[PDB]
Design a protein around this ligand. Sequence first.
Ligand SMILES: NC(=O)c1ccc[n+]([C@@H]2O[C@H](COP(=O)([O-])OP(=O)(O)OC[C@H]3O[C@@H](n4cnc5c(N)ncnc54)[C@H](OP(=O)(O)O)[C@@H]3O)[C@@H](O)[C@H]2O)c1
Ligand SMILES: NC(=O)c1ccc[n+]([C@@H]2O[C@H](COP(=O)([O-])OP(=O)(O)OC[C@H]3O[C@@H](n4cnc5c(N)ncnc54)[C@H](OP(=O)(O)O)[C@@H]3O)[C@@H](O)[C@H]2O)c1
Ligand SMILES: NC(=O)c1ccc[n+]([C@@H]2O[C@H](COP(=O)([O-])OP(=O)(O)OC[C@H]3O[C@@H](n4cnc5c(N)ncnc54)[C@H](OP(=O)(O)O)[C@@H]3O)[C@@H](O)[C@H]2O)c1
Ligand SMILES: NC(=O)c1ccc[n+]([C@@H]2O[C@H](COP(=O)([O-])OP(=O)(O)OC[C@H]3O[C@@H](n4cnc5c(N)ncnc54)[C@H](OP(=O)(O)O)[C@@H]3O)[C@@H](O)[C@H]2O)c1
Ligand code: NI
Ligand code: NI
Lengths: 260, 260, 260, 260
Amino acid sequence: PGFTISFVNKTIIVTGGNRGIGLAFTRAVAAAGANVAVIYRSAADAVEVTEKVGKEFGVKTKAYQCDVSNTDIVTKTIQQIDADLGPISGLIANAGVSVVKPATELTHEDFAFVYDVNVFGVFNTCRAVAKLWLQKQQKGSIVVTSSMSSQIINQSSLNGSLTQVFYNSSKAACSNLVKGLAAEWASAGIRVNALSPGYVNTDQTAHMDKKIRDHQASNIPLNRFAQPEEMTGQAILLLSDHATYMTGGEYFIDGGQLIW
Amino acid sequence: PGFTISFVNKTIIVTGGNRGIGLAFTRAVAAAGANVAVIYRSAADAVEVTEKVGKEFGVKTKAYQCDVSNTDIVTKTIQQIDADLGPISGLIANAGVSVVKPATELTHEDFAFVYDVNVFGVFNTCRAVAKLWLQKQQKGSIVVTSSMSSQIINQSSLNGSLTQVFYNSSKAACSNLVKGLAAEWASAGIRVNALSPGYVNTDQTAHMDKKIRDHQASNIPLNRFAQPEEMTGQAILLLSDHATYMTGGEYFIDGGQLIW
Amino acid sequence: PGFTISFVNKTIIVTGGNRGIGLAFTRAVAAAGANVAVIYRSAADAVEVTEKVGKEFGVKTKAYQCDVSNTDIVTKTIQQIDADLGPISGLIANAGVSVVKPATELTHEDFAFVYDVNVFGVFNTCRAVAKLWLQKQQKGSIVVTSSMSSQIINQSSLNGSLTQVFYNSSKAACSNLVKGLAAEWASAGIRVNALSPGYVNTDQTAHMDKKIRDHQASNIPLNRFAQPEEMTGQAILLLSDHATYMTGGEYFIDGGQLIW
Amino acid sequence: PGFTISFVNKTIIVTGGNRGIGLAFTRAVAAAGANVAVIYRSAADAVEVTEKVGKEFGVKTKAYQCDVSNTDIVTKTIQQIDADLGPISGLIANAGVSVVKPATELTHEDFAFVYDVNVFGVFNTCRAVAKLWLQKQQKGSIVVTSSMSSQIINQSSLNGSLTQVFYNSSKAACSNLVKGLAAEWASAGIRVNALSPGYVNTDQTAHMDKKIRDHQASNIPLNRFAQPEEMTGQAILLLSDHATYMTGGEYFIDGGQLIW
Ligand SMILES: NC(=O)c1ccc[n+]([C@@H]2O[C@H](COP(=O)([O-])OP(=O)(O)OC[C@H]3O[C@@H](n4cnc5c(N)ncnc54)[C@H](OP(=O)(O)O)[C@@H]3O)[C@@H](O)[C@H]2O)c1
Ligand SMILES: NC(=O)c1ccc[n+]([C@@H]2O[C@H](COP(=O)([O-])OP(=O)(O)OC[C@H]3O[C@@H](n4cnc5c(N)ncnc54)[C@H](OP(=O)(O)O)[C@@H]3O)[C@@H](O)[C@H]2O)c1
Ligand SMILES: NC(=O)c1ccc[n+]([C@@H]2O[C@H](COP(=O)([O-])OP(=O)(O)OC[C@H]3O[C@@H](n4cnc5c(N)ncnc54)[C@H](OP(=O)(O)O)[C@@H]3O)[C@@H](O)[C@H]2O)c1
Ligand SMILES: NC(=O)c1ccc[n+]([C@@H]2O[C@H](COP(=O)([O-])OP(=O)(O)OC[C@H]3O[C@@H](n4cnc5c(N)ncnc54)[C@H](OP(=O)(O)O)[C@@H]3O)[C@@H](O)[C@H]2O)c1
Ligand code: NI
Ligand code: NI
């Protein structure tokens, strides 16, 4: 016996999944038996990484160069993906960026950068996929990758902020957006939810400032940064049919940071 | 391939696991392979029901009459469970009650009735198990059934409250308690999280004021109360080793009610 | 010119209004012109302190020994206050207690002690006043002293809990109870709101572990504990007719602690 | 006696201060004795309205045409205001817009519009003022008009969404942005807080179908929309020295809407 979730013959779209957390979602869903599309921006080795993933788990994988902030480019990639692997069963909007500068120095360009990917993009992908499912009367489940930063401001030092007000605020927008979409699409048997990670280990971490990184680790009850691997379980559940009564919600994987 | 969580050769305790949502948890974990200890208060058929579950899923089950509001009975019951089916791998503190009366009419007795089970009962159950795990240097995961009522006040009619202020406030207390316990037990490898259901269909529903029931359903995005089975997936994940970075959190299964 | 709130010829009840934050409230409403009924449990100088306030601010005051955890004593006291200083215009349900012990060591007796004052006591006080208002067909405003502890767990050291799980959970209950009461009494012109302080300097502060005190102030954006007087402006606003559209809310005065 | 807040000899800037809620703020702070700098986009009668306010309350006022989404113009306008009425004592970043359209039909243009004002516009204004205060070592208080929409999704009909996902999501961003800014400027003696109204009766709100507004009011505990004046008390408190321990917070004036 055992609790089993299977995505065999099912395709899940996953943005920014050629690396970082996206790659964790990539493998996880695949390992669960899913065909997977890795949307990326300019990763030189994205097509490779994808291929490697698909051959390791015995599933159908294909990468796609695509700036989620671009309406038409996203509306096509989605139409295409649905021809290479349709019909679509689930989506995981994870592509995200950030700017770190004192608030007084943030420029319009910075705002645009962050919000076009971290907020407009998420919206863009969801609408695209939703219209499709709506058009063909297909049900679906969407998982938006937010952050605990939707609730708190991160620290870079004791009582000292990690300056990225556009990032944190874009994540708040993100988590709220999930509710707005779930609200309109619920009647169409379409579910939308947010997964919000805490401090996670990624390649960039080993190259960040150590005084900072340590401090960030000093106030986590679990006493450590997460591994991207620790974010996928909640996603599978959210995508699975076990979650028919779950929509418009935000699910934190913060290691207890939000307790303090 | 697929996503699997197995509780084979593991024991899970479920309070109020003989009926309602608790039984759903019981059957769900029993189907995942765990042996189950069902704690109940006074249901005449609790023993029969529990025995059957064990026969249906081919697992070891046992029922224990144990008022969760009683310190010593709970301590003794946890010890007996550890002897009968130990070691205990997880706990679902699900037992809960309510009192529906206009706020002005609520008594101190009503307060104790609700809080002794919904808050102290949760604390007591969690503490007994945690103490055992601490003594035996064992890791564990605890899931507490709270409610979306921790965040909002329920309605019985348009703009009209379902009058049960001790219920909603006790659930808010419960969800906070989860954070408090999670903070102290984190270093001991013990995780504590809250699962908060929205409106769920149980045997009591069919006997409630239709008008109130219809009204409550008329404002849920998914347009219906949940079936108890819809709460189990999240519970299983929280109990599983995949949820290693999840503690002190509250996970809603409200069908979008919190959207509004 | 200026913004002025006058409570001349109005009476406010303050539970725990003889010392600590409660006394700050008493003094503030008195300075605003209100007559004040001070409820206390056993302080030997409660009468003297209350008399001094009246003389200092030229208002009528009276102290009432009244255990808020007891239904009938509260009912009788509210009736006497109405007879002595009626009509009652507002209430600050401020009396509260705590128990600091590791969670595993907390008892049912500790639970009763904290919850009978912090939750039942608040409910009971609110209920007695509201019943009088409803009977006499009078309008009113109630402010409950909760705590930022309703949202977070406090620290006694870096990544180390200030162990008082019944306190934090009781405050979460309190803040939710405010919503429940506000929901039922809204149509009768009775508003109920929670005021939630962060770390505050009181007489007990000067006698607490200095290491703990320093740690707690080290992670507050404003770099310091608040003075009791800094809690009064919000209370006066909530009690006034400027707050006609404010009910069911929780108003934090945390110095930015909740930002992190 | 009485509680009195005086802004005599102080200058407050109010964006969108020529009509709706912004005009209520303007009048409220003028009545408190503050000089007012009113920022507007293109209103044809803003000058007349602003002047009338000054003459009515015997304070100095001036209107400034200034698109808050424009970096340079805002910077220039702030410089001019400082020269004209400086030092600036407070800022109410109130300007805001919305787009009501089914989520599937929303465009990038719509995104840029809403977010340039509701988020960047707020950031831009706060930053222009903050930089000035820092350069001159001046303390100050900032209030940002967000919305309860930061937490929930509005309805247009029973279980039917008021489709404007970009609005609600931008407000969530806004309230988070307040925390972000408050975190960085706390050590500088600058406080930042969000004031989040429920349904308010302004000309703009009145533009949507009365059927929709009747539905909305039917589910507000206070059973009506607020008048803009009902938002002013909290703003005055936040801008005042009584709010010295209040920063990074969100203060709802929702009529109890968030109770449900
Ligand atoms: N790292 C953390 O501790 C943490 C915590 C909470 C939340 N998150 C969120 O989780 C996500 C991934 O985090 P991460 O640290 O792995 O990020 P990362 O290492 O910076 O990876 C982000 C990925 O997004 C893609 N991307 C960037 N801009 C894009 C655009 N315009 N269109 C399409 N794709 C774009 C990039 O693909 P290309 O490689 O091809 O350029 C990049 O791989 C982000 O949303 C992040 O905000 C991260
Ligand atoms: N029903 C809903 O729509 C709903 C929604 C959200 C959350 N919840 C929460 O989910 C949990 C279960 O709900 P439910 O609807 O299944 O409840 P139920 O149908 O009322 O069953 C609750 C069970 O708890 C047990 N119990 C009560 N007091 C106890 C005590 N002192 N000691 C030991 N056991 C005790 C009872 O055992 P006996 O069978 O022996 O009487 C009862 O079976 C509760 O915490 C509830 O508040 C319910
Ligand atoms: N201190 C803080 O940093 C802090 C922070 C956040 C929130 N708060 C909250 O603010 C409130 C006041 O705090 P505080 O520090 O001023 O408290 P305190 O110094 O401990 O005084 C509390 C008062 O409550 C009264 N009281 C206790 N039990 C009572 C009962 N059964 N019946 C009637 N009165 C009773 C006592 O009256 P007697 O004088 O006769 O003993 C006592 O004066 C509490 O709700 C507390 O939880 C405090
Ligand atoms: N009304 C409600 O029920 C309600 C509820 C919650 C929150 N709010 C929020 O409260 C605020 C005001 O609401 P309202 O109903 O009074 O709105 P309104 O009647 O639409 O007024 C908004 C004002 O903002 C100004 N504005 C717009 N874009 C601007 C820009 N780019 N630069 C400078 N000024 C700009 C406009 O000036 P011009 O006059 O020259 O056009 C306009 O007067 C908004 O932030 C809104 O989101 C309103
Ligand atoms: Ni926090
Ligand atoms: Ni709500």
